Amino acid sequence: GISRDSRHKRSATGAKRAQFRKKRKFELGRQPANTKIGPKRIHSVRTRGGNQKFRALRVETGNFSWGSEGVSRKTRIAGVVYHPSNNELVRTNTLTKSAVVQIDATPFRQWYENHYGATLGKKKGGAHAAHAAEVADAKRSRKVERKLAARSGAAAIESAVDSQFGSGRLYAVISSRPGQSGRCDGYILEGEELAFYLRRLTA
Amino acid sequence: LTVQSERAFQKQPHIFTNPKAKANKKTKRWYKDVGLGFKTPKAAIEGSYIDKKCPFAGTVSIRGKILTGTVVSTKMHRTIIIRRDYLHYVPKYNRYEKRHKNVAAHVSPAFRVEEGDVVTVGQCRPISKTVRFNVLKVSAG
Amino acid sequence: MKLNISYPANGTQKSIDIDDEHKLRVFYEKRMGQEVEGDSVGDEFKGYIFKITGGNDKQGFPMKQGVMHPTRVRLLLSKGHSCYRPRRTGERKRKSVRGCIVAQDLSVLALSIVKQGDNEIEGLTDTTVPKRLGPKRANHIRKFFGLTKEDDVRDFVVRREVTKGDKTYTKAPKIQRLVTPQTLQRKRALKAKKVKNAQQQRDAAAEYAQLLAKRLHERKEERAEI
Amino acid sequence: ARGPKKHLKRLAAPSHWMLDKLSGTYAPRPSAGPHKLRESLPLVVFLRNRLKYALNGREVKAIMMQQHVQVDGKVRTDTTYPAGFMDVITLEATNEHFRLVYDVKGKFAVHRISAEEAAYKLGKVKKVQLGKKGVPYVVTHDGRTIRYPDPLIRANDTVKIDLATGKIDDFIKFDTGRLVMVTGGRNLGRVGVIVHREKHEGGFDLVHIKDALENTFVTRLSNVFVIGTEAGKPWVSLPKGKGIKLSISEERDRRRAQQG
RNA sequence: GAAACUGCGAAUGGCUCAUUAAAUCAGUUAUCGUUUAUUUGAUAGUAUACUUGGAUAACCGUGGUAAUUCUAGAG
RNA sequence: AUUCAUAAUAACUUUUCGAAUCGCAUGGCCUUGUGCUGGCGAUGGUUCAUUCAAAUUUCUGCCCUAUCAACUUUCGAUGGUAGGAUAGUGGCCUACCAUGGUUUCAACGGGUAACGGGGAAUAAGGGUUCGAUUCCGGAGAGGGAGCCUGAGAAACGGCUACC
């Protein structure tokens, strides 16, 4: 099958090598997973040493990290917007490592609203401002008011991340290897990395 | 020579710069000491280049053979080939013949290399089809 | 074709050689699993309904479930497939099998009686054969006799009688999963070992902590001397 | 080739076993265990070729199936168990105890020891690091791991292991002036004292040693084994010869002194 | 104490030298670049239970093919 | 020499496993209940270490041939970034990018009536010739290729296909 040997290559001088043995099992390769966004479908592969890999064929959700806040939530992948290796992966919505995705911002919104007692998005929408104003003042005890007050100051986030929350979709990058671990995890894009990928996306 | 000249964002893996803590608004940079009496060049510590194959600001370690040779080509990106002259002994004639080997080595942006220079390279893990060595010291020639 | 007719309810089996093609025309184009009525097949089979369960063709190749063919196909068989018993772990063979659709090219057609219509049969419906072994697992015995979880299962175990010359005796199945003082002894022993192990580990960690503290404080005064 | 080897050709056997050339095609392949295949001494060899108790391998299996043989206080039923350096061999039915210690000749000499000394063993510390739950441990040269070792125990140190409990009694620091024994190379088996340790980063550490007769000989740090605190005071019993090298003329003279 | 289910071994050995010219191999290195049955040491009190199921082989019986270490119904 | 060992926080998982197993003996406690307890072993099972091993790997070293002088890069050739795949590194493969890599110090090509070495004969010295073959390493099982099982095989006294 697929082989990872280097003996089938030409020499560094350009010489053609002669075959030295038949293909070995300890030098095999396998087909790519080509993970798509869809209802979960994970297959198991028995590997060298009797070990076991998981090939993500389709995945709906992933574990995503907010690095500057130190909290990670299980949210929903909305799609792929950018892939450095190949734009065809974007076009077909193929999840690999380093792909830039949009995830649902809902769980992170709940965490931030519960934690700092504020709102994200800056969208004074018709029904949006109703929610924003209600979140501003809720039914809430006094020691919790004080803990939130102490938590303010470290409550504003950077503008570029904040402006995204009005859509419910945050930009993110996959960090796991879905074809290997069977999971599609990542972190929220922030800082100059976010600025770089926004510059690429606007083209 | 901008750092971000690729499709993907260039970063050192797992070195997190928080955009929220407070001022000192520059990205933190990791580097290491390779050991064996080699100094970390200043461009590695206060530099801004990203190079996962650098011995100092990258994930490759130096271990095994230490070689020296003359640089004969700098026409690849971040890779050089060096020439190692030596003398082979032929016992029957009690004499020598001139021989040479070409070795490909990674060169970090922390160094500056030109053809005609003598460099010391340390052995790393295979980082290319032909590269197993990495520049650790550049001598002007 | 012959008809290997069997009767699961009484465990009777016998083969019937029907050489008349027009009789067994209701079997044609039917599948294993499908059920048929025997009014057209013969005359004694009036009111009977049979389930087609397989058979072998004129060359002896068995019928196999799932092969949608009245003809022979060639399949790669592995562990679990019918019509093949693997000889080595992981071994697969490619073998010829007959499809599940009944046609006229079959040497035999295995049948199972589903319902007994109006008459009897010579050696199938009018007789019975006993089961060969009784229950052996404890709760199988209990569910066989409806026994509750209080009755001593040991005294209701079936015991076949074996004769030898004149000294006739009984053979009784050993029962599995039967609780004895030995099994409870082992269940006690495993937990006792776990708890004792945890105690020794806690003692070792405590001793290490005491050693660390002694070194720490003697270091405090030793560097306080200098 | 397709998997592990299970036979051992007789000419491929280690040279310290003193195997004859013509007894057969094969030699006992030592099992996997606490010592390296090349630096071990399988029990069948020890009880057949050395002690001469058994006449053949089938008798070695007859002996060992009856619980007679113990190594480090534990009964072994493995005819090819990889007994190695410092291992204590005990024969209860004959009430007899042995320790495998190299002689100056480079062989595992047959060394009878007392029952009181047959209750511990020395062990060279190979590494120390923390395990699961933050617990530190050291590894000896026989694959023994001991949890909660003394905070001062480092590599190349020797610990005194209590065989009944597997716990560390006391340890010896590696430093200048220590009584050591050479466990590899040309100087296998010779006992000396540390004079100077020479360091080479990335390469090999050399250790200058000196015998009781003042001859200095250098050896790789990997082949050193700390066996005593000072000169003349080891923590184990020495083989007949005290680990002292004699020239060929000297051994000829001593042989003709005790046989003529 | 047959049969059969389960476990392990069958990747060792033995044979041969066709292919193979920086390949094999030799002496030296490296794994801070990995997998590792087995052996030997350690190693887990985790936030219906006086012990759960329901198949299946061996076995009985009906058999098909000229023929195979083929096997099929059914209990 | 490390982003090592290890520890911590937030979560995650078609939730891994923290014993529904076996043989001998069966003793001890009285609040005598078919109570509570407990000796020597078998087989298990997570992780680390160790051992038996594998897989890649640095440096240097091969016979004849120019009636072989240029070779490699179409369809990976040399290198860079990202990914996929692998037990893992690596053009090992893919996408994008650069134009590199070897060579009269003999590359590339051709021949070998070439498996390599430990070794053998001859032997002033220097050399010349032999080594399929008792040991070590490699490769193969009529020829190719593809696989299952398994810790480990691209196994052939295993399977699949073609000749």
Automatic annotation (TrEMBL), chain A:
For whether the record's keyword set contains Repressor, the answer is no
Keywords for this entry? Answer: Metal-binding, Ribonucleoprotein, Ribosomal protein
InterPro entries per the record? Ribosomal_eS8, Ribosomal_eS8_CS, Ribosomal_protein_eS8_euk, Ribosomal_Se8/biogenesis_NSA2
Keyword Metal-binding attributed: yes
A cellular-component GO term for this protein: ribosome
Give the Gene Ontology MF terms in alphabetical order: metal ion binding; structural constituent of ribosome
UniProt-annotated binding residues for Mg(2+) 2: 90
Which residues does the annotation say bind Mg(2+) 1? 20
Q: Name one GO biological process term.
A: translation
Q: Which Gene3D superfamilies match?
A: 3.10.290.70, Ribosomal protein S8e, subdomain (1.10.168.20)
PANTHER family in alphabetical order: 40S RIBOSOMAL PROTEIN S8
Q: To which protein family does this belong? A: Belongs to the eukaryotic ribosomal protein eS8 family.
Record-linked NCBIfam families: eS8
Q: What is this protein called?
A: 40S ribosomal protein S8
Origin organism is: Candida albicans (Yeast)
TrEMBL record, chain C:
Is the keyword Transcription assigned to this protein? no
A GO CC term assigned to this protein in UniProt: ribonucleoprotein complex
Q: Which UniProt keywords apply?
A: Metal-binding, Ribonucleoprotein, Ribosomal protein
| GO process annotations (BP) | translation
Q: Where does Mg(2+) bind?
A: 176
InterPro entries hit by this protein: Ribosomal_eS6 (IPR001377), Ribosomal_eS6-like (IPR014401), Ribosomal_eS6_CS (IPR018282)
PROSITE patterns noted in UniProt: RIBOSOMAL_S6E
**Cited Pfam families:** Ribosomal_S6e
For this chain, one GO molecular function annotation is: metal ion binding
Secretion signal, residue range per the UniProt entry? none
Tell me its family: Belongs to the eukaryotic ribosomal protein eS6 family.
Report the protein name in the record. Answer: 40S ribosomal protein S6
Organism of this sequence: Candida albicans
Tell me what gene encodes this.
RPS6A
